[PDB]
Structure formats: C-alpha cells, structure tokens
Amino acid sequence: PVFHTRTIESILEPVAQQISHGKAIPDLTAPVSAVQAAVSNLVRVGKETVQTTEDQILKRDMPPAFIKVENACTKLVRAAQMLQADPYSVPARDYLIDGSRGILSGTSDLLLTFDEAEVRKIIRVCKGILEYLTVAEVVETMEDLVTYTKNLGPGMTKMAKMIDERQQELTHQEHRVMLVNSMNTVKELLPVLISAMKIFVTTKNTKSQGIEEALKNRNFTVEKMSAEINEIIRVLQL
C-alpha cells in the first residue's frame, strides 16, 4: 500500500518495487553482509530512541519492529550461506524472498510507529489551543482580554506553522486539502473571536441588554473553532 509521507516513500518505495518476483544465483555474502551491518545499526538507533523518548506508545510498539527486521535479516544471512552451497536450492530461494519481505515490513512498521510519535506531539499543540479556547468565557474586563490575546495570538501562530509543515509531507491529497482548509477556517476565525469578546466585555462594563446576543456569538465562534481543531486532529491520524 501507498506510503503516506513523502519521506517514508523515498526510503521504502525503491525496494518495495524490487520485492516483486529458474537457475543460477550469484554469491550474495558480500551484499547480504552489508544489509546485516545496516540492520544492526537500525536496531542500535531503535533501542536509543526507546530509552530516550517520553512516549509510552513508542516504547511498546518500536521494539517488536526492530525484532521483526532482526529475525528477517537472519533469514537473509542464512539464505546466502545455503545458496553458496547450491545456487539452485529452492529452499534458499524462499528464505531470501521472505527474508527481504520481512525486512521491508519491519522497517515500514518501525517508521509507521515513529511517525505516530511525531503526530502526537502535533496533536498536543492542537489540544493546547483547544484548552485555551474554553477559557474565553471567563474574560470580563478589558485588560483581561489583552492578557488573553497576548497568549493565544502567538499560540495560534505556532499551530499554523506546524500544521502547514506537516501537510506538505503527506502523499495523500485529499488529506492535505482537509488540513489546509481547517487551519484556514481557524485562522480567519481568530479576529472574529477577539472582536466577539471585545463586544462582550464592552456590553458588560456598560450594561446594555444585548449581552445575551454577544455571549452567544462568542460561544458560537468558540464552538466553530473547536469543531475544526478536532477535525484537524482526526485527519492528522490517516
């Protein structure tokens, strides 16, 4: 299946194609030995990323992936041995096939697992903005609105830049378009919310009945912004 993320694709596509399969099989010990060295290094980096992370999901999912490419590389190292003895060995032929297949899967798994880690980081940036929207209803003075704008202003900015950088990476197009729209809606809606609050606060500090009205446009805007951010979160996970 299609590797999502322009990065996973450049790593795995060339060899995913090749893995789409007679007589003589040349002597593979030199090349298979370079696979074996590289997979040792991958497992190395894996173990490191595990002890170094604070993500619980990454800790339980990444190891089973090193192991899978590790045992798959074993099958490749052994298939070479065998093919050297009998170039026409049908056994050996299959270990090589499954060996390579295992290496493709595990590596892919490992990266799918690492990609999920990065998505959670992003998800948490969103949840931060979602939290801070729920605090909108408590701003009642005009100087407390200034505090608010000061924190949420830059916060929206960080979210925008980082969703933007994320979408450019996906290799699915509808997913890319869903994100971009949703980040646009939320960005357009920020000055609307401030204006909404600015109206509430004024209508409060002056007492003018149209405060029933102001409070519900404020709320409608908070809701529309929240509905969208949850949509960003959903899409992030495909």
Partner: peptide, 21 residues
C-alpha cells in the same frame, strides 16, 4: 532523526542484494 538515515541505509543495502538477481 537518525532513524530515517539508518532505515535508508538498510533499504539501500537490501536493494543491492536484490539488484544481483
């Protein structure tokens, strides 16, 4: 991350085995 470069070094290595059939 270092993860990507290591994975690529296994993807490349493996290609060289297969390009020998």
């Amino acid at each position: 991350x270092x993860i990507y470069x290591x994975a690529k070094x296994v993807x490349x290595x493996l290609s060289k085995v297969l390009x020998x059939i």
